[PDB]
Amino acid sequence: APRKFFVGGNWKMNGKRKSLGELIHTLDGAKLSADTEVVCGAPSIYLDFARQKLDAKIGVAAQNCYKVPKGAFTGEISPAMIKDIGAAWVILGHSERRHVFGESDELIGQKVAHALAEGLGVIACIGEKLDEREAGITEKVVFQETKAIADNVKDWSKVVLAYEPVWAIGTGKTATPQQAQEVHEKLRGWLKTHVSDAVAVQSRIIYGGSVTGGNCKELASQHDVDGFLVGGASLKPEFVDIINAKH
Amino acid sequence: APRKFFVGGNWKMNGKRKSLGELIHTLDGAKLSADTEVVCGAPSIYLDFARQKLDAKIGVAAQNCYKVPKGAFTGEISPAMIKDIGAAWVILGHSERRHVFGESDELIGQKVAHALAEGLGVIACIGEKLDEREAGITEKVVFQETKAIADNVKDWSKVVLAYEPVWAIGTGKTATPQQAQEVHEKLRGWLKTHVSDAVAVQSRIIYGGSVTGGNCKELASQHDVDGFLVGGASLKPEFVDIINAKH
Protein backbone atom coordinates (compact mmCIF):
# COMPACT_ATOMS: atom_id res chain seq x y z
CA ALA A 1 0.00 0.00 0.00
CA PRO A 2 2.63 2.46 1.20
CA ARG A 3 5.54 1.93 -1.20
CA LYS A 4 7.45 3.72 1.55
CA PHE A 5 9.65 6.39 -0.03
CA PHE A 6 13.10 4.93 -0.61
CA VAL A 7 16.49 6.57 -0.86
CA GLY A 8 19.59 4.60 -1.80
CA GLY A 9 22.93 6.24 -1.00
CA ASN A 10 25.70 4.44 -2.91
CA TRP A 11 29.17 5.68 -2.00
CA LYS A 12 31.00 3.83 -4.75
CA MET A 13 34.81 3.64 -4.69
CA ASN A 14 35.10 7.20 -3.36
CA GLY A 15 35.21 8.68 0.17
CA LYS A 16 38.32 8.70 2.38
CA ARG A 17 38.19 7.93 6.15
CA LYS A 18 37.69 11.58 7.01
CA SER A 19 35.19 12.63 4.37
CA LEU A 20 33.11 9.49 4.95
CA GLY A 21 33.01 10.00 8.72
CA GLU A 22 31.96 13.56 7.96
CA LEU A 23 29.17 12.51 5.61
CA ILE A 24 27.78 10.01 8.11
CA HIS A 25 27.94 12.40 11.06
CA THR A 26 26.08 14.96 8.96
CA LEU A 27 23.44 12.44 7.89
CA ASP A 28 22.94 11.53 11.55
CA GLY A 29 22.47 15.07 12.83
CA ALA A 30 20.23 15.59 9.83
CA LYS A 31 16.94 15.41 11.70
CA LEU A 32 14.94 15.14 8.51
CA SER A 33 13.68 11.57 8.71
CA ALA A 34 10.02 10.97 7.96
CA ASP A 35 8.29 7.92 6.56
CA THR A 36 11.52 7.52 4.60
CA GLU A 37 13.66 4.40 4.33
CA VAL A 38 17.28 5.61 3.88
CA VAL A 39 19.86 2.94 3.05
CA CYS A 40 23.61 3.68 2.87
CA GLY A 41 26.16 1.46 1.11
CA ALA A 42 29.98 1.72 1.09
CA PRO A 43 33.08 -0.23 0.00
CA SER A 44 33.33 -3.61 1.74
CA ILE A 45 35.89 -2.39 4.29
CA TYR A 46 34.64 1.09 4.99
CA LEU A 47 31.52 -1.05 5.48
CA ASP A 48 32.20 -1.83 9.14
CA PHE A 49 33.10 1.77 9.90
CA ALA A 50 29.86 2.81 8.18
CA ARG A 51 27.81 0.41 10.32
CA GLN A 52 29.52 1.42 13.53
CA LYS A 53 29.53 5.17 12.96
CA LEU A 54 26.02 5.27 11.43
CA ASP A 55 22.63 4.85 13.12
CA ALA A 56 19.82 2.33 12.60
CA LYS A 57 17.62 4.84 10.77
CA ILE A 58 20.06 4.67 7.85
CA GLY A 59 20.26 1.03 6.76
CA VAL A 60 23.64 -0.12 5.41
CA ALA A 61 23.56 -2.02 2.13
CA ALA A 62 26.75 -2.96 0.27
CA GLN A 63 27.34 -2.61 -3.46
CA ASN A 64 28.08 -6.01 -4.97
CA CYS A 65 27.24 -9.23 -3.13
CA TYR A 66 28.48 -12.77 -3.79
CA LYS A 67 26.47 -16.00 -4.06
CA VAL A 68 27.78 -18.93 -1.93
CA PRO A 69 28.54 -19.07 1.82
CA LYS A 70 32.32 -19.49 1.71
CA GLY A 71 34.95 -20.36 -0.86
CA ALA A 72 38.00 -19.99 -3.03
CA PHE A 73 37.60 -16.65 -4.81
CA THR A 74 40.45 -14.30 -4.01
CA GLY A 75 38.93 -10.77 -4.13
CA GLU A 76 35.11 -11.35 -3.91
CA ILE A 77 33.18 -11.73 -0.60
CA SER A 78 30.13 -13.47 0.78
CA PRO A 79 27.13 -11.70 2.27
CA ALA A 80 27.51 -13.68 5.44
CA MET A 81 30.42 -11.28 6.02
CA ILE A 82 28.62 -7.94 5.89
CA LYS A 83 25.95 -9.79 7.81
CA ASP A 84 28.13 -10.81 10.81
CA ILE A 85 29.61 -7.30 10.80
CA GLY A 86 26.43 -5.19 10.64
CA ALA A 87 25.08 -4.68 7.10
CA ALA A 88 21.45 -5.67 6.34
CA TRP A 89 21.15 -4.90 2.59
CA VAL A 90 23.02 -5.53 -0.70
CA ILE A 91 22.75 -3.87 -4.14
CA LEU A 92 23.54 -5.96 -7.23
CA GLY A 93 23.04 -5.91 -10.99
CA HIS A 94 24.44 -2.31 -11.27
CA SER A 95 24.83 -1.18 -14.90
CA GLU A 96 28.49 -0.59 -13.83
CA ARG A 97 28.97 -4.23 -12.64
CA ARG A 98 27.07 -5.21 -15.80
CA HIS A 99 29.33 -3.32 -18.17
CA VAL A 100 32.81 -3.48 -16.54
CA PHE A 101 33.04 -6.97 -14.92
CA GLY A 102 30.69 -8.85 -17.25
CA GLU A 103 28.49 -10.15 -14.38
CA SER A 104 25.44 -11.87 -15.88
CA ASP A 105 21.66 -11.99 -15.47
CA GLU A 106 22.35 -15.47 -14.25
CA LEU A 107 24.80 -14.06 -11.72
CA ILE A 108 22.38 -11.36 -10.57
CA GLY A 109 19.83 -14.12 -10.10
CA GLN A 110 22.03 -16.49 -8.08
CA LYS A 111 23.19 -13.49 -6.02
CA VAL A 112 19.66 -12.33 -5.22
CA ALA A 113 18.62 -15.87 -4.27
CA HIS A 114 21.53 -16.51 -1.87
CA ALA A 115 21.07 -13.11 -0.23
CA LEU A 116 17.37 -13.73 0.38
CA ALA A 117 17.91 -17.34 1.54
CA GLU A 118 20.39 -15.83 3.96
CA GLY A 119 18.16 -13.04 5.23
CA LEU A 120 19.65 -10.18 3.27
CA GLY A 121 17.70 -7.28 1.88
CA VAL A 122 18.06 -7.11 -1.85
CA ILE A 123 18.37 -4.25 -4.24
CA ALA A 124 18.09 -5.40 -7.88
CA CYS A 125 19.53 -2.94 -10.42
CA ILE A 126 17.90 -3.34 -13.94
CA GLY A 127 19.06 -1.03 -16.81
CA GLU A 128 18.86 0.16 -20.44
CA LYS A 129 21.63 1.99 -22.42
CA LEU A 130 21.07 4.72 -25.03
CA ASP A 131 22.02 2.48 -27.95
CA GLU A 132 19.41 -0.11 -27.03
CA ARG A 133 16.65 2.23 -25.85
CA GLU A 134 17.09 3.52 -29.37
CA ALA A 135 16.74 0.39 -31.49
CA GLY A 136 13.89 0.39 -28.95
CA ILE A 137 14.81 -2.55 -26.69
CA THR A 138 13.98 -0.80 -23.37
CA GLU A 139 11.22 -3.38 -23.17
CA LYS A 140 13.42 -6.40 -23.85
CA VAL A 141 16.30 -5.22 -21.65
CA VAL A 142 14.34 -4.31 -18.52
CA PHE A 143 11.67 -6.97 -18.93
CA GLN A 144 14.26 -9.72 -19.30
CA GLU A 145 16.41 -8.66 -16.33
CA THR A 146 13.36 -8.32 -14.09
CA LYS A 147 12.49 -11.81 -15.30
CA ALA A 148 15.89 -13.08 -14.21
CA ILE A 149 15.55 -11.36 -10.84
CA ALA A 150 12.05 -12.57 -10.03
CA ASP A 151 12.86 -16.03 -11.39
CA ASN A 152 15.88 -16.50 -9.15
CA VAL A 153 13.81 -14.77 -6.48
CA LYS A 154 11.80 -16.30 -3.57
CA ASP A 155 9.58 -13.53 -2.19
CA TRP A 156 9.92 -9.77 -1.88
CA SER A 157 9.00 -8.64 1.65
CA LYS A 158 12.65 -7.56 1.45
CA VAL A 159 13.04 -6.54 -2.20
CA VAL A 160 13.43 -3.39 -4.28
CA LEU A 161 13.63 -2.78 -8.05
CA ALA A 162 15.82 0.19 -9.17
CA TYR A 163 15.41 1.29 -12.82
CA GLU A 164 18.47 2.74 -14.59
CA PRO A 165 18.36 4.60 -17.90
CA VAL A 166 21.95 4.88 -19.13
CA TRP A 167 20.75 6.70 -22.23
CA ALA A 168 21.10 9.69 -19.91
CA ILE A 169 23.99 8.80 -17.58
CA GLY A 170 27.08 10.87 -18.34
CA THR A 171 25.99 10.19 -21.90
CA GLY A 172 24.69 13.70 -22.60
CA LYS A 173 20.87 14.10 -22.76
CA THR A 174 17.93 15.04 -20.46
CA ALA A 175 15.97 12.44 -18.43
CA THR A 176 12.50 13.79 -17.49
CA PRO A 177 9.76 13.09 -14.92
CA GLN A 178 8.17 11.62 -18.00
CA GLN A 179 10.59 9.01 -19.34
CA ALA A 180 10.71 7.88 -15.70
CA GLN A 181 6.96 7.63 -15.19
CA GLU A 182 6.79 5.85 -18.57
CA VAL A 183 9.45 3.17 -17.97
CA HIS A 184 8.49 2.81 -14.30
CA GLU A 185 4.79 2.30 -15.08
CA LYS A 186 5.73 -0.36 -17.61
CA LEU A 187 8.10 -2.31 -15.35
CA ARG A 188 5.42 -2.23 -12.66
CA GLY A 189 2.85 -3.69 -15.05
CA TRP A 190 5.35 -6.37 -16.26
CA LEU A 191 5.96 -7.12 -12.62
CA LYS A 192 2.32 -7.33 -11.65
CA THR A 193 1.31 -9.52 -14.62
CA HIS A 194 4.15 -12.00 -14.17
CA VAL A 195 4.13 -12.20 -10.36
CA SER A 196 0.76 -11.09 -8.92
CA ASP A 197 -0.97 -7.98 -7.55
CA ALA A 198 0.21 -8.36 -3.91
CA VAL A 199 3.85 -8.59 -5.11
CA ALA A 200 3.46 -5.92 -7.78
CA VAL A 201 2.01 -3.77 -5.17
CA GLN A 202 4.15 -4.11 -2.11
CA SER A 203 7.42 -4.21 -4.22
CA ARG A 204 9.04 -0.78 -4.56
CA ILE A 205 10.38 0.86 -7.70
CA ILE A 206 13.04 3.59 -7.56
CA TYR A 207 14.69 5.94 -10.11
CA GLY A 208 18.34 5.21 -10.83
CA GLY A 209 19.67 8.45 -12.37
CA SER A 210 21.05 11.95 -11.64
CA VAL A 211 18.99 12.78 -8.59
CA THR A 212 19.68 16.26 -7.20
CA GLY A 213 18.28 19.10 -5.19
CA GLY A 214 15.16 20.05 -7.15
CA ASN A 215 15.09 16.89 -9.30
CA CYS A 216 14.19 14.66 -6.32
CA LYS A 217 11.11 16.78 -5.65
CA GLU A 218 10.44 17.02 -9.37
CA LEU A 219 10.47 13.25 -9.87
CA ALA A 220 8.74 11.97 -6.77
CA SER A 221 6.13 14.61 -7.46
CA GLN A 222 5.54 11.74 -10.01
CA HIS A 223 3.01 8.92 -9.47
CA ASP A 224 4.30 5.31 -9.82
CA VAL A 225 7.68 6.37 -8.41
CA ASP A 226 8.62 5.21 -4.88
CA GLY A 227 12.32 6.17 -4.56
CA PHE A 228 15.79 6.75 -5.95
CA LEU A 229 19.45 5.84 -6.22
CA VAL A 230 21.92 8.68 -5.72
CA GLY A 231 25.68 8.55 -6.47
CA GLY A 232 27.62 11.80 -7.38
CA ALA A 233 25.21 14.04 -5.65
CA SER A 234 24.81 11.74 -2.62
CA LEU A 235 28.31 12.86 -1.53
CA LYS A 236 27.05 16.04 0.08
CA PRO A 237 24.25 17.33 2.30
CA GLU A 238 22.53 16.79 -1.03
CA PHE A 239 21.39 13.41 0.34
CA VAL A 240 19.28 14.98 3.08
CA ASP A 241 18.23 17.72 0.70
CA ILE A 242 17.11 15.03 -1.86
CA ILE A 243 15.74 12.49 0.64
CA ASN A 244 13.39 15.23 1.87
CA ALA A 245 11.52 14.89 -1.47
CA LYS A 246 7.71 14.71 -1.09
CA HIS A 247 4.37 15.64 -2.82
CA ALA B 1 71.10 -12.50 1.81
CA PRO B 2 69.23 -9.85 -0.19
CA ARG B 3 66.08 -12.04 -0.19
CA LYS B 4 64.07 -13.41 2.76
CA PHE B 5 61.33 -16.12 2.83
CA PHE B 6 58.11 -14.44 1.65
CA VAL B 7 54.92 -15.99 3.12
CA GLY B 8 51.59 -14.59 1.95
CA GLY B 9 48.21 -15.82 3.28
CA ASN B 10 45.35 -15.65 0.81
CA TRP B 11 42.15 -16.21 2.78
CA LYS B 12 39.65 -16.05 -0.04
CA MET B 13 36.17 -15.75 1.52
CA ASN B 14 36.04 -18.06 4.57
CA GLY B 15 36.26 -15.26 7.14
CA LYS B 16 34.50 -15.06 10.49
CA ARG B 17 35.09 -12.71 13.44
CA LYS B 18 35.69 -15.52 15.95
CA SER B 19 37.92 -17.50 13.62
CA LEU B 20 40.07 -14.56 12.55
CA GLY B 21 40.63 -13.38 16.12
CA GLU B 22 41.77 -16.84 17.29
CA LEU B 23 44.00 -17.36 14.23
CA ILE B 24 45.59 -13.96 14.82
CA HIS B 25 46.15 -14.48 18.51
CA THR B 26 47.62 -17.97 17.98
CA LEU B 27 49.87 -16.52 15.28
CA ASP B 28 50.87 -13.60 17.46
CA GLY B 29 51.57 -15.62 20.59
CA ALA B 30 53.56 -17.80 18.17
CA LYS B 31 57.32 -17.53 17.57
CA LEU B 32 58.25 -16.36 14.05
CA SER B 33 61.73 -15.66 12.64
CA ALA B 34 62.98 -12.35 11.26
CA ASP B 35 64.59 -13.67 8.08
CA THR B 36 61.02 -14.59 7.05
CA GLU B 37 58.46 -11.96 5.96
CA VAL B 38 54.80 -12.68 6.77
CA VAL B 39 51.76 -11.04 5.15
CA CYS B 40 48.06 -12.02 4.99
CA GLY B 41 45.11 -10.68 2.95
CA ALA B 42 41.34 -11.15 3.33
CA PRO B 43 37.95 -9.55 2.58
CA SER B 44 37.93 -5.80 2.20
CA ILE B 45 35.58 -5.52 5.17
CA TYR B 46 37.86 -7.61 7.41
CA LEU B 47 41.16 -6.08 6.28
CA ASP B 48 40.60 -3.31 8.85
CA PHE B 49 39.71 -5.53 11.82
CA ALA B 50 42.83 -7.42 10.86
CA ARG B 51 45.17 -4.43 11.02
CA GLN B 52 43.54 -2.97 14.15
CA LYS B 53 44.31 -6.33 15.73
CA LEU B 54 47.30 -8.25 14.41
CA ASP B 55 50.72 -7.81 15.93
CA ALA B 56 52.58 -4.84 14.51
CA LYS B 57 55.12 -7.13 12.82
CA ILE B 58 52.65 -9.01 10.54
CA GLY B 59 52.21 -7.74 6.93
CA VAL B 60 48.83 -7.02 5.28
CA ALA B 61 47.30 -7.16 1.78
CA ALA B 62 44.09 -6.83 -0.29
CA GLN B 63 43.35 -9.78 -2.62
CA ASN B 64 42.13 -7.08 -5.03
CA CYS B 65 41.71 -3.46 -6.10
CA TYR B 66 40.37 -1.73 -9.22
CA LYS B 67 42.88 0.06 -11.54
CA VAL B 68 41.39 3.39 -10.36
CA PRO B 69 41.39 5.39 -7.05
CA LYS B 70 38.26 7.61 -6.87
CA GLY B 71 35.64 6.42 -9.28
CA ALA B 72 32.38 4.96 -10.30
CA PHE B 73 33.09 1.22 -10.02
CA THR B 74 30.30 -0.27 -7.86
CA GLY B 75 31.83 -3.01 -5.69
CA GLU B 76 35.48 -2.13 -6.48
CA ILE B 77 38.00 -1.35 -3.66
CA SER B 78 40.92 1.04 -4.36
CA PRO B 79 44.69 0.95 -3.88
CA ALA B 80 44.24 4.33 -2.37
CA MET B 81 41.56 3.26 0.22
CA ILE B 82 43.96 0.43 1.01
CA LYS B 83 46.71 2.83 2.00
CA ASP B 84 44.25 5.30 3.60
CA ILE B 85 43.28 2.48 5.99
CA GLY B 86 47.04 1.75 6.15
CA ALA B 87 47.32 -1.48 4.12
CA ALA B 88 50.60 -1.94 2.16
CA TRP B 89 50.24 -5.14 0.09
CA VAL B 90 47.99 -5.65 -2.93
CA ILE B 91 47.15 -8.79 -4.98
CA LEU B 92 46.52 -8.52 -8.70
CA GLY B 93 45.44 -11.00 -11.44
CA HIS B 94 45.16 -14.20 -9.28
CA SER B 95 44.06 -17.44 -11.01
CA GLU B 96 40.68 -17.55 -9.31
CA ARG B 97 40.04 -14.05 -10.45
CA ARG B 98 41.34 -14.65 -13.86
CA HIS B 99 39.45 -17.88 -14.61
CA VAL B 100 36.12 -17.72 -12.71
CA PHE B 101 35.66 -13.94 -13.22
CA GLY B 102 37.32 -12.41 -16.38
CA GLU B 103 40.53 -10.46 -15.60
CA SER B 104 43.36 -10.03 -18.13
CA ASP B 105 46.96 -9.05 -18.78
CA GLU B 106 46.48 -5.41 -19.84
CA LEU B 107 44.11 -5.07 -16.81
CA ILE B 108 46.55 -6.62 -14.36
CA GLY B 109 49.29 -4.42 -15.77
CA GLN B 110 47.39 -1.14 -15.62
CA LYS B 111 46.56 -2.02 -11.99
CA VAL B 112 50.10 -2.97 -10.95
CA ALA B 113 51.20 0.31 -12.42
CA HIS B 114 48.67 2.45 -10.41
CA ALA B 115 49.45 0.38 -7.29
CA LEU B 116 53.19 0.97 -7.68
CA ALA B 117 52.27 4.60 -8.21
CA GLU B 118 50.19 4.98 -5.02
CA GLY B 119 53.37 3.78 -3.26
CA LEU B 120 51.90 0.31 -2.60
CA GLY B 121 53.65 -3.12 -2.82
CA VAL B 122 52.47 -5.09 -5.83
CA ILE B 123 51.82 -8.81 -5.68
CA ALA B 124 51.25 -10.21 -9.11
CA CYS B 125 49.78 -13.55 -10.09
CA ILE B 126 51.17 -15.43 -13.11
CA GLY B 127 49.37 -18.68 -13.94
CA GLU B 128 49.74 -21.87 -15.98
CA LYS B 129 46.73 -24.11 -16.58
CA LEU B 130 46.23 -27.70 -17.85
CA ASP B 131 45.66 -27.03 -21.57
CA GLU B 132 48.68 -24.75 -21.81
CA ARG B 133 50.90 -26.86 -19.58
CA GLU B 134 49.93 -29.70 -21.89
CA ALA B 135 50.51 -28.23 -25.35
CA GLY B 136 53.86 -27.07 -23.87
CA ILE B 137 52.89 -23.43 -24.36
CA THR B 138 53.02 -22.91 -20.60
CA GLU B 139 56.39 -21.16 -21.29
CA LYS B 140 54.89 -18.78 -23.83
CA VAL B 141 51.99 -17.79 -21.57
CA VAL B 142 54.06 -17.46 -18.36
CA PHE B 143 56.65 -15.19 -20.14
CA GLN B 144 53.95 -13.03 -21.86
CA GLU B 145 52.26 -12.66 -18.43
CA THR B 146 55.58 -11.83 -16.79
CA LYS B 147 56.34 -9.16 -19.43
CA ALA B 148 52.87 -7.53 -19.17
CA ILE B 149 53.53 -7.42 -15.40
CA ALA B 150 57.10 -6.22 -15.94
CA ASP B 151 56.24 -3.37 -18.30
CA ASN B 152 53.42 -2.07 -16.19
CA VAL B 153 56.03 -2.39 -13.28
CA LYS B 154 59.51 -0.81 -12.96
CA ASP B 155 60.27 -0.51 -9.17
CA TRP B 156 61.09 -4.17 -8.61
CA SER B 157 61.71 -3.82 -4.83
CA LYS B 158 57.98 -3.34 -3.94
CA VAL B 159 57.31 -5.92 -6.65
CA VAL B 160 56.71 -9.64 -5.97
CA LEU B 161 55.89 -12.34 -8.61
CA ALA B 162 53.72 -15.38 -7.62
CA TYR B 163 53.62 -18.57 -9.83
CA GLU B 164 50.38 -20.56 -10.02
CA PRO B 165 50.32 -24.27 -11.15
CA VAL B 166 46.58 -24.63 -12.12
CA TRP B 167 46.89 -27.82 -14.18
CA ALA B 168 46.58 -28.85 -10.54
CA ILE B 169 42.95 -27.47 -10.47
CA GLY B 170 40.20 -30.15 -10.20
CA THR B 171 42.45 -32.28 -12.43
CA GLY B 172 43.05 -35.03 -9.89
CA LYS B 173 46.65 -34.01 -10.25
CA THR B 174 49.65 -32.70 -8.37
CA ALA B 175 52.43 -30.35 -9.35
CA THR B 176 55.92 -31.81 -8.95
CA PRO B 177 58.38 -29.86 -6.82
CA GLN B 178 60.35 -30.46 -10.12
CA GLN B 179 57.76 -28.67 -12.25
CA ALA B 180 57.56 -25.62 -9.93
CA GLN B 181 61.44 -25.39 -9.74
CA GLU B 182 61.43 -25.53 -13.58
CA VAL B 183 58.75 -22.76 -13.85
CA HIS B 184 60.64 -20.52 -11.33
CA GLU B 185 64.02 -20.95 -12.95
CA LYS B 186 62.57 -20.16 -16.47
CA LEU B 187 60.59 -17.14 -15.14
CA ARG B 188 63.87 -15.73 -13.65
CA GLY B 189 65.68 -16.14 -16.98
CA TRP B 190 62.87 -14.34 -18.81
CA LEU B 191 63.00 -11.53 -16.26
CA LYS B 192 66.93 -11.55 -16.60
CA THR B 193 66.58 -11.28 -20.37
CA HIS B 194 63.98 -8.47 -20.42
CA VAL B 195 64.94 -6.24 -17.49
CA SER B 196 68.61 -7.06 -16.43
CA ASP B 197 70.89 -9.08 -14.12
CA ALA B 198 70.32 -7.02 -10.96
CA VAL B 199 66.59 -7.53 -11.38
CA ALA B 200 66.67 -11.26 -12.23
CA VAL B 201 68.74 -11.65 -8.98
CA GLN B 202 66.90 -9.49 -6.52
CA SER B 203 63.35 -10.15 -7.75
CA ARG B 204 61.24 -12.53 -5.56
CA ILE B 205 59.45 -15.38 -7.20
CA ILE B 206 57.06 -17.24 -4.86
CA TYR B 207 55.01 -20.48 -5.27
CA GLY B 208 51.21 -19.94 -5.40
CA GLY B 209 50.15 -23.55 -4.70
CA SER B 210 49.18 -26.07 -2.00
CA VAL B 211 51.72 -26.10 0.85
CA THR B 212 51.53 -27.82 4.28
CA GLY B 213 53.94 -28.87 7.05
CA GLY B 214 54.81 -32.08 5.24
CA ASN B 215 55.74 -30.41 1.94
CA CYS B 216 57.03 -27.17 3.53
CA LYS B 217 60.71 -27.94 4.45
CA GLU B 218 61.19 -29.87 1.18
CA LEU B 219 59.66 -27.20 -1.01
CA ALA B 220 61.33 -24.34 0.76
CA SER B 221 64.73 -26.01 0.58
CA GLN B 222 63.86 -26.44 -3.17
CA HIS B 223 66.66 -23.91 -3.82
CA ASP B 224 65.21 -21.53 -6.48
CA VAL B 225 62.17 -20.87 -4.33
CA ASP B 226 61.52 -17.89 -1.96
CA GLY B 227 58.33 -19.06 -0.20
CA PHE B 228 54.58 -19.35 -0.52
CA LEU B 229 51.41 -17.61 -1.60
CA VAL B 230 49.19 -19.96 0.55
CA GLY B 231 45.47 -20.55 0.64
CA GLY B 232 43.79 -22.97 3.00
CA ALA B 233 46.88 -23.17 5.19
CA SER B 234 46.64 -19.60 6.40
CA LEU B 235 43.23 -20.06 8.07
CA LYS B 236 44.62 -22.19 11.02
CA PRO B 237 47.89 -22.77 12.95
CA GLU B 238 48.92 -25.04 10.09
CA PHE B 239 50.38 -21.72 8.86
CA VAL B 240 52.52 -21.21 12.01
CA ASP B 241 53.47 -24.94 12.26
CA ILE B 242 54.76 -24.28 8.68
CA ILE B 243 56.40 -20.90 9.45
CA ASN B 244 58.42 -22.58 12.09
CA ALA B 245 58.49 -26.11 10.53
CA LYS B 246 60.44 -24.33 7.81
CA HIS B 247 63.97 -24.57 9.33
Side-chain angles (χ1 to χ4, degrees):
Chain A
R3 246 181 302 117
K4 21 206 187 194
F5 214 34
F6 199 68
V7 192
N10 164 357
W11 295 351
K12 286 151 171 196
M13 189 205 31
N14 272 79
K16 269 185 183 165
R17 283 303 286 289
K18 43 174 157 156
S19 47
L20 278 194
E22 252 168 295
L23 225 288
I24 36 193
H25 281 59
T26 292
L27 275 304
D28 290 340
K31 183 27 77 206
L32 295 311
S33 41
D35 41 70
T36 297
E37 237 172 354
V38 163
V39 190
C40 239
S44 323
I45 13 68
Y46 279 358
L47 203 141
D48 219 332
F49 178 71
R51 194 42 271 165
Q52 266 179 71
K53 184 145 312 186
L54 274 139
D55 350 27
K57 173 157 30 97
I58 281 186
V60 171
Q63 16 131 321
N64 176 258
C65 148
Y66 201 62
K67 51 162 189 165
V68 188
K70 48 164 181 166
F73 334 89
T74 274
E76 297 287 318
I77 220 167
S78 149
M81 317 223 200
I82 32 185
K83 184 181 159 182
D84 109 291
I85 201 168
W89 285 97
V90 181
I91 121 63
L92 296 162
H94 198 296
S95 48
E96 283 182 17
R97 280 261 135 213
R98 295 180 196 258
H99 297 178
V100 185
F101 305 139
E103 312 235 332
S104 73
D105 301 282
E106 312 185 43
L107 205 67
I108 274 56
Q110 302 169 63
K111 299 164 164 334
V112 173
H114 198 74
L116 303 164
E118 328 201 34
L120 274 187
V122 188
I123 300 171
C125 272
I126 66 271
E128 161 195 72
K129 181 178 160 176
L130 180 165
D131 283 23
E132 313 165 315
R133 162 170 259 263
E134 177 44 45
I137 320 311
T138 89
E139 304 278 289
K140 300 204 156 201
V141 177
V142 185
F143 295 6
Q144 293 182 204
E145 309 185 305
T146 314
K147 187 163 195 291
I149 296 162
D151 150 30
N152 300 119
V153 172
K154 202 88 162 171
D155 90 287
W156 322 66
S157 59
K158 323 164 225 72
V159 187
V160 207
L161 294 164
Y163 164 69
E164 285 193 329
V166 168
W167 82 264
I169 188 183
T171 278
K173 286 185 181 181
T174 283
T176 73
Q178 293 320 296
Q179 256 81 32
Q181 184 292 112
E182 171 69 282
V183 166
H184 257 57
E185 199 166 325
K186 298 301 191 177
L187 189 61
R188 186 185 308 290
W190 191 114
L191 207 81
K192 163 200 178 189
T193 65
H194 304 100
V195 187
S196 54
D197 309 89
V199 182
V201 174
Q202 57 167 30
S203 303
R204 283 161 262 164
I205 311 188
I206 77 177
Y207 182 43
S210 72
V211 190
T212 61
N215 279 38
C216 74
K217 177 214 172 136
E218 152 182 336
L219 274 182
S221 72
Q222 192 65 43
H223 309 343
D224 244 297
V225 173
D226 342 68
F228 342 36
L229 213 55
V230 132
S234 76
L235 305 186
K236 309 156 308 225
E238 209 125 337
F239 198 29
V240 191
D241 265 282
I242 294 171
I243 303 180
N244 290 169
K246 68 182 186 185
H247 281 282
Chain B
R3 202 195 299 158
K4 58 290 174 182
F5 210 46
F6 200 80
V7 185
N10 197 292
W11 318 345
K12 329 228 171 183
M13 99 189 50
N14 272 268
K16 200 195 65 159
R17 220 91 144 149
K18 296 197 189 193
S19 319
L20 280 189
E22 263 181 284
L23 146 107
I24 289 162
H25 277 106
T26 308
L27 250 107
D28 292 342
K31 157 190 134 52
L32 316 169
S33 40
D35 160 9
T36 321
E37 176 168 35
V38 193
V39 187
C40 42
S44 326
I45 76 190
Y46 287 142
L47 282 179
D48 181 32
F49 160 66
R51 199 55 265 174
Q52 274 170 349
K53 168 58 200 202
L54 298 141
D55 169 277
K57 205 43 197 93
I58 310 208
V60 166
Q63 319 147 2
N64 213 357
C65 37
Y66 183 72
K67 76 174 55 186
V68 307
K70 80 174 204 144
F73 297 86
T74 305
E76 261 329 274
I77 273 8
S78 114
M81 318 204 78
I82 282 83
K83 274 213 304 282
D84 162 328
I85 287 308
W89 285 108
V90 56
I91 321 202
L92 294 177
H94 199 275
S95 85
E96 285 156 41
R97 301 255 101 236
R98 253 193 250 235
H99 176 122
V100 55
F101 297 134
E103 294 184 63
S104 66
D105 300 322
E106 90 206 314
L107 187 71
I108 287 38
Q110 289 171 61
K111 294 210 209 192
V112 182
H114 189 206
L116 304 191
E118 305 326 326
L120 215 76
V122 163
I123 276 189
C125 289
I126 53 72
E128 183 230 313
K129 346 170 276 279
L130 194 60
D131 166 299
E132 305 143 350
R133 162 146 307 264
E134 216 116 84
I137 196 52
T138 262
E139 242 97 353
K140 164 203 171 69
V141 309
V142 175
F143 294 145
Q144 287 197 257
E145 273 184 350
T146 302
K147 139 178 181 210
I149 291 175
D151 288 19
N152 298 271
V153 177
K154 200 49 91 176
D155 200 40
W156 287 99
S157 54
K158 274 203 171 168
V159 183
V160 178
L161 275 184
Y163 171 94
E164 311 185 72
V166 183
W167 53 288
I169 222 196
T171 315
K173 174 69 63 42
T174 309
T176 73
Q178 202 68 71
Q179 279 110 4
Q181 167 94 7
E182 192 70 84
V183 170
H184 274 77
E185 312 176 349
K186 316 317 147 87
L187 284 164
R188 205 171 318 277
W190 192 93
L191 199 50
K192 173 90 161 266
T193 304
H194 316 78
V195 195
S196 94
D197 281 271
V199 188
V201 192
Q202 315 290 268
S203 163
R204 210 174 342 173
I205 306 163
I206 67 196
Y207 192 33
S210 216
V211 188
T212 156
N215 316 127
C216 203
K217 191 168 298 156
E218 8 284 20
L219 254 183
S221 75
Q222 203 30 260
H223 178 240
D224 223 288
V225 207
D226 308 311
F228 332 100
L229 183 56
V230 220
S234 45
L235 293 169
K236 316 295 174 50
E238 189 74 347
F239 221 29
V240 160
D241 252 11
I242 294 172
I243 315 292
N244 301 139
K246 184 280 189 160
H247 82 278

